[PDB]
Amino acid sequence: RNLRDLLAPWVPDAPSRALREMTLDSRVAAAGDLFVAVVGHQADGRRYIPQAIAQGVAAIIAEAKDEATDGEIREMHGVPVIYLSQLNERLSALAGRFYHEPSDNLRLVGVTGTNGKTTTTQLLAQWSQLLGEISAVMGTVGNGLLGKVIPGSAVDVQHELAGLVDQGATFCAMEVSSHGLVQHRVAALKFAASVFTNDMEHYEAAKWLLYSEHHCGQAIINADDEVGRRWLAKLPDAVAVSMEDHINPNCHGRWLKATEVNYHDSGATIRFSSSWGDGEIESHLMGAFNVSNLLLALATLLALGYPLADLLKTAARLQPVCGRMEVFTAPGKPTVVVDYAHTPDALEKALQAARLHCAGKLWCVFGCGGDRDKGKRPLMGAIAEEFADVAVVTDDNPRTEEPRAIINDILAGMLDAGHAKVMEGRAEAVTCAVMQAKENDVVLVAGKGHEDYQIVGNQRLDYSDRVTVARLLGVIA
């Protein structure tokens, strides 16, 4: 890494100078580093140029705004200081060149949207890897190769992506936040594909301008979303994806539509037609939204050139995100779903998702955390009463608060608290549901998802919903 090579596209006559790491933070700036001095939230990194110099940085690139001309080369204590105009906008491209253009050395798929980003990213990484990629995710859970995910600026994005290139990643599914796109955090990334999951004039105008600046590659758009359709009208090469009959086939563009979905006790049977051919997928995922997420990942990988027959042969091995509508079924036992839903909206969505798969009674086993906001307790009670047939109210991380007090606040939210079943011991309430429910019933166990712990008092006790359920059903969590 060399200041002269680094700046070649922008500053012809930049001093030659070996560089170690690139950092925006004056405090961790070490001997040989490149320090980047940026202006942002009431924060001027140009203040910290003396400190960085004192710490032995090889060179500095700074905002030119009010200080200097674009490409102005100065020299402070023998340290090259180079000024660039609009450094915030150029930070992605600068870090990209520093880290050897990692998005040009793997297939990067970007996923944007309010919901389903995590599941769609996770499904793209899994499906690509089933077809022989070494696949990685960057998102909210964290970053890493699949199954090795470790819990942020334009530089960190490029750095992390370069790190996955070094670990052998050939594919990466990245969640792109609305706030990341506006902040220019992914401005220089070469996306193979951009997936969209789900005052309007400005909003659209803002985003359209940003999108037109990015390398988006293949555009894959949920046509079941109202905004998705308007954007598809403007994008003739974009793939339209639907499970609610919103493919306008007059366009002669690429498309993928679920024709029939059967929601059964262990997943979803998805019949679909596409411009690539027709197929049947056995999904082990639960709910309508996960059908959508799966069809977006399928359309994306078809658009990138993965053969339909290979995607089909491998679809059955796609897994849920741990503790996200995760199904446990055993020969002749009730279906059980572990979901991490711990808010009224999440609890309602998970019960609506679970009802689609339930021929009999829908059981909801849940509780609310102690020494937290009490506002959600009666709202979650009311949702369990409405969208479940049986509400089993139990403990969920009661901490120092009287456990039965939390239950009382949940029951108060209901029209008919006496219809609720109350059972303390979380483990005992889960047992009560699983052991009483019929073979064609569904037991939603909400609140913890992947948490392997029940905080009672100051104690973090070893407890898993997934393990309690797996053991009751006679299966392995």
From Swiss-Prot:
Pathway named in the protein's UniProt entry: Cell wall biogenesis; peptidoglycan biosynthesis
Highest rank taxon of the organism: Bacteria
EC main group: ligase
A GO term from the CC aspect: cytosol
Amino acids binding meso-2,6-diaminopimelate: R372, D396, N397, P398, R399, G447, E451
Localization terms from the record: Cytoplasm
Regulation: Activated by potassium phosphate.
GO molecular-function terms, A-Z: ATP binding; magnesium ion binding; UDP-N-acetylmuramoylalanyl-D-glutamate-2,6-diaminopimelate ligase activity
N6-carboxylysine found at: K207
Source organism (scientific name): Escherichia coli (strain K12)
Keyword terms, alphabetized: ATP-binding, Cell cycle, Cell division, Cell shape, Cell wall biogenesis/degradation, Cytoplasm, Ligase, Magnesium, Nucleotide-binding, Peptidoglycan synthesis
EC assignment: 6.3.2.13
Stated family: Belongs to the MurCDEF family. MurE subfamily.
Post-translational events: Carboxylation is probably crucial for Mg(2+) binding and, consequently, for the gamma-phosphate positioning of ATP.
Motif (Meso-diaminopimelate recognition motif): 396-399
Catalytic activity line of the entry: UDP-N-acetyl-alpha-D-muramoyl-L-alanyl-D-glutamate + meso-2,6-diaminopimelate + ATP = UDP-N-acetyl-alpha-D-muramoyl-L-alanyl-gamma-D-glutamyl-meso-2,6-diaminopimelate + ADP + phosphate + H(+)
Primary location group: cytoplasm
Keyword Cell wall biogenesis/degradation: yes
Binding site for UDP-N-acetyl-alpha-D-muramoyl-L-alanyl-D-glutamate: L24, S26, H41, Q42, A43, S177, Q183, R185
PANTHER family: MUR LIGASE FAMILY MEMBER, UDP-N-ACETYLMURAMOYL-L-ALANYL-D-GLUTAMATE--2,6-DIAMINOPIMELATE LIGASE MURE HOMOLOG, CHLOROPLASTIC
Co-factor(s): Mg(2+)
Claim: Cell cycle is one of the keywords in the record: yes
pH dependence comment: Optimum pH is about 8.
Residues binding ATP, per UniProt: G113, T114, N115, G116, K117, T118, T119
Disulfide bonds: none
Protein name: UDP-N-acetylmuramoyl-L-alanyl-D-glutamate--2,6-diaminopimelate ligase
